[PDB]
């Protein structure tokens, strides 16, 4: 319903790397797997495939599959909580 979510969504594209910050939560990075309307709630939703199992779903909500990923690796959030861009996975193999 927000204009803000409408704005923030303008440039969000499936395939984009991103960083999700919902509320108090610690920033989490992943890849945009879905952008747009869904069946569970009105407005725009961004489905994200997380780098770690820090999500709430496996790409499906209420039995409707929106995208694919392993359990706990997917999440749906409002566009205003998503920053898209060069957000590489936070990992250090050796330093």
From Swiss-Prot:
Transmembrane segments: none annotated. It comes from the Eukaryota. Residues 36-78 form the CAP-Gly domain. It is found in: Cytoplasm; Cytoplasm, Cytoskeleton. Disulfide bonds: none annotated. Belongs to the TBCB family. Supercomplex made of cofactors A to E. Cofactors A and D function by capturing and stabilizing tubulin in a quasi-native conformation. Cofactor E binds to the cofactor D-tubulin complex; interaction with cofactor C then causes the release of tubulin polypeptides that are committed to the native state. Binds to alpha-tubulin folding intermediates after their interaction with cytosolic chaperonin in the pathway leading from newly synthesized tubulin to properly folded heterodimer. This is Tubulin-specific chaperone B. The lineage of its organism: Eukaryota, Metazoa, Ecdysozoa, Nematoda, Chromadorea. The gene is tbcb-1. The chain holds residues 135 to 229 of 229 of the full protein.
């Amino acid at each position: 319903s927000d204009k803000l979510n409408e704005e923030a969504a303008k440039n969000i594209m499936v395939g984009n790397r991103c960083e999700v910050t919902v509320g108090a939560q610690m920033a989490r990075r992943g890849e945009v797997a879905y952008v747009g309307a869904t069946k569970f709630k009105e407005g725009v939703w961004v489905g994200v495939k997380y780098d770690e199992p820090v999500g709430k779903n496996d790409g499906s909500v209420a039995g409707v599959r929106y995208f694919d990923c392993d359990p706990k690796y997917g999440g749906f959030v409002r566009p205003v909580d998503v920053k898209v861009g060069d957000f590489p996975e936070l990992s250090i193999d050796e330093i």
